[PDB]
Amino acid sequence: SSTNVG
Amino acid sequence: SSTNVG
Amino acid sequence: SSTNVG
Amino acid sequence: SSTNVG
């Protein structure tokens, strides 16, 4: 899984 | 899964 | 699954 | 599944 917040 | 917030 | 918020 | 919010 991956979570990316710019 | 992936969650991307610009 | 994927969630993308611009 | 996918959810995209511009």
Partners of D1 in the β-ladder: none
| Experimental approach | X-ray
Contact B5 C1 (CB under 8 A): no
Could you give the angle at the alpha carbon of D4 between the alpha carbons of D2 and D6, nearest 5°?
Answer: 175
List all chains that touch chain C, counting a touch as 3 or more CB pairs closer than 8 Å: B, D
Q: Please give, rounded to a whole number of angstroms, the shortest distance from the CA of B3 to a CA of chain C.
A: 5
Q: What is the resolution of this structure in A?
A: 1.6
User: What is the pairing mode between strands A2-5 and C2-5?
Assistant: unpaired
Q: Residue C2 contacts by C-beta under 8 Å, 6 or more apart in sequence?
A: B1, B2, B3, B4, D1, D2, D3
CB-nearest partner of B6 from C1, C2, C6: C6
Closest CA to C2 of A5, D6, A2: A2
Q: Is D3 exposed, middle or buried (0-12, 13-18, 19+ CB in 10 A)?
A: exposed
